[PDB]
Ligand binder design. Structure first.
Ligand SMILES: OC[C@H]1O[C@H](O)[C@@H](O)[C@@H](O)[C@@H]1O
Ligand SMILES: OC[C@H]1O[C@H](O)[C@@H](O)[C@@H](O)[C@@H]1O
Ligand SMILES: OC[C@H]1O[C@H](O)[C@@H](O)[C@@H](O)[C@@H]1O
Ligand SMILES: OC[C@H]1O[C@H](O)[C@@H](O)[C@@H](O)[C@@H]1O
Ligand SMILES: [Ca+2]
Ligand SMILES: [Ca+2]
Ligand SMILES: [Ca+2]
Ligand SMILES: [Ca+2]
Ligand SMILES: [Mn+2]
Ligand SMILES: [Mn+2]
Ligand SMILES: [Mn+2]
Ligand SMILES: [Mn+2]
Lengths: 117, 113, 113, 117, 117, 113, 113, 117
């Protein structure tokens, strides 16, 4: 399964690698996060997250805040084009299992640029 | 060579410019990526995904700079008092990608390798 | 509510984010909406169309302002000395629109009503 | 057949309505242009055209130049949403018949905005 | 005094030309509006206005709504570059006299493009 | 040839990138283009103007298309029950433009010609 | 809170929206940040700087993300056959910044600490 | 002297720190570059450079190519707001001394965003 995802994880799965706490993670080809950081989830309120990538600074970064509180930040160095193909589609994904939670999205904004020679 | 930029601030019921996979849907102008109780309560064993219609060029032989920025506003809530599961994710995958297993998998991966 | 913006400055051979109809193709980084002689000369009775992958919202019940701006760089040339035909057009049509008759029709309309 | 198109016409078809000269036209549901203006085509060189629409000024406008010469301008008042549906796809189209011409596109740039209440 | 302004007028000054009702106006070099349209002001709530210009459609347009109600629209044909110089600065202005009102601005967004040959 | 785009969503107290004329000021993240009572009530005979720092090219000899779009969110309110005056305006004027008379003049014009 | 974006593709002689320091000037639609021989040849001991009119917010107490992207097209050429000096730089400095010593200093710094 | 600059250096000044070769450098408060990379200058041709910053990936990056050849890349980790004040102006600067070179700029494009809480 090929994919790169940034995740806001509410349920811990130690057998899956999840550290012991609500976290946000950067994943490359596996649910086994490469890097992880503590995220202070908040029921009812809405969260804003920015994710940015740059083929030159070979860095992918995430920052997520909750309007009023301190943000959470995670950065991982990658060269995306070695992990993913030349053509991609971008998406948002949410899931549940034995346990539930409402997965809702309010506005989503995305912009991308590619430069050649 | 190429540039793509799109913005959503409300989610129309018939979002012709999004691809829907799983129990993902939209009502009251928001995106419900996870199935819902006819009363408005979260259900179990649900997986939902949304993909922007258009493909996106990430790289090219003679190309040297690729960059993307996206901001997301999402809400994870639960009326209940039990533990909340599972996850919300922003992902980039090959165009023909299809939803995977739910649970702590986030409809992103099948196993745990 | 919604915003869409895209830019092309070269046309890759495999333009996954464009829809192709007719003899429209791409080589040498340009868009050849009309068939071509294996020597690089224009042919007769050809129709080619290109559509941006993603659908676009033009209007909505409770909506009041819709605007679009597009700039196009095209070249109409002929090596021959005869009269040149037929036309080049920028069009907006329902998503499932399909190419129509050629000639002075510009693969846009079937008859002349 | 439903469609709105701006056309740069090189071959005249009086039976189709085309005036007697290379022209650029705005078409609403028919090859029979609603308005037309004289366009000074130029073999070999490349042309730049800007097309703009505004639901409030209920106006659709075109300007096309050739780098070095005078431009050509055409404007027609419409309320696009009465002619086209709520969902559209945008495209470029070119054709030939008994007579030929090379139909090539170099860069194409498009941006759109919609505002609700 | 040189200036082009779009105004949301709350106080009527018939001696100044103001029609008999809260109106929005397009002004060219004079407080004596060239065109005017009825605007349904609303104390306490906030208003959103979009103003657009295009040198080709030679049209300047305004639309202002109040979130929940019907908008107000006004359009006037001008060729701005005959009225104003080549270099301009853009601003927001508000005033009072014998009578008062709070003049407050919340977010303001502006974008401009110019194309040459 | 040239493009300029700027956005404000809050108004910082020290807005180095705005020019201030008259009783125009900013507090609590909003723009108070009109003087205010130390209790937060509107005063009489006030004129306030704000100008974006940078000059803007509107036209040029060999140039053919100039366009601008701006969206404004403003609030005209009064705690009192008397009639409200006077006006709110969006204006474009030569760079060195200075505030004019108040009243139904909107700090835009001196007389009524 | 704030956003600023500007683009230049030609440099008008009277660039009201740029600040000029030193021998920096503009002719033939380009920016000549370094003095020039009335024949069009580079001179010695020259320093030129250009600054975008408007100030730019880089940071703020309750703010968490600031980003900027700029692309520059410049040409360093010399008709002569001697060694070429000195440098071309893109800099961000407090608004009232003024040109400094030339040479390998790039009109940016006074000493070499 | 306060400033952050990215430089394309043609003349070497070992007493100033310049390594022994045409280089591009990132400078923080001093002509004494913090990091440097080999840049293959080219008389007569024109160069394109992109510089990007991100307060979260705490990285500043440069890439410069020459249309046809391989690019040059340099990255340095900084938290700009510790080095510079809250208000800045952005500029291009060029100089000469005993030796000369033509310092010309063709198009320049800049865009910036700041986000608060
Ligand atoms: O409810 C969350 C939890 O439920 C079950 O135990 C499984 O589906 C897990 O994969 C998942 O993490
Ligand atoms: O070649 C141009 C001309 O050719 C034929 O006569 C027909 O296909 C016409 O529709 C077309 O306009
Ligand atoms: O208070 C509004 C009204 O007050 C006075 O009569 C004058 O300043 C007028 O110009 C203005 O319109
Ligand atoms: O010409 C380049 C060289 O000239 C002189 O030696 C001095 O001005 C130096 O600072 C400079 O680097
Ligand atoms: Ca998990
Ligand atoms: Ca025809
Ligand atoms: Ca009045
Ligand atoms: Ca040096
Ligand atoms: Mn996880
Ligand atoms: Mn025709
Ligand atoms: Mn009036
Ligand atoms: Mn150096």
């Amino acid at each position: 399964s090929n994919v790169v995802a940034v995740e806001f994880d509410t349920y811990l799965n130690p057998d899956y690698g999840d550290p012991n706490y609500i976290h946000i993670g950067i994943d490359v080809n596996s649910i086994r996060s490469k890097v992880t950081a503590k995220w202070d989830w908040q029921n009812g309120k809405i969260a804003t997250a920015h994710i940015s990538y740059n083929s030159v600074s070979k860095r992918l970064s995430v920052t997520s805040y909750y309007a009023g509180s301190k943000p959470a930040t995670l950065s991982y160095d990658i060269e995306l084009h070695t992990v993913l193909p030349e053509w991609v589609r971008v998406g948002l994904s949410a899931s549940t299992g034995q346990d539930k939670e409402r997965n809702t999205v309010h506005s989503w904004s995305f912009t991308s640029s590619l430069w050649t020679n | 060579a190429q540039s793509l930029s799109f913005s959503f601030t409300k989610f129309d019921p018939n979002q012709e410019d999004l691809i829907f996979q799983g129990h993902a849907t939209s009502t009251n102008n928001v995106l419900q990526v996870t199935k819902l109780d006819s009363a408005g309560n979260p259900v179990s064993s649900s997986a939902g995904r949304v993909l922007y219609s258009a493909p996106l060029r990430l790289w090219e032989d003679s190309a040297v700079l690729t960059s993307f920025d996206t901001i997301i506003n999402f809400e994870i809530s639960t009326p209940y008092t039990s533990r909340i599961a599972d996850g919300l994710a922003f992902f980039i995958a090959p165009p023909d990608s299809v939803i995977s297993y739910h649970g702590g998998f986030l409809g992103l991966f099948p196993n745990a390798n």
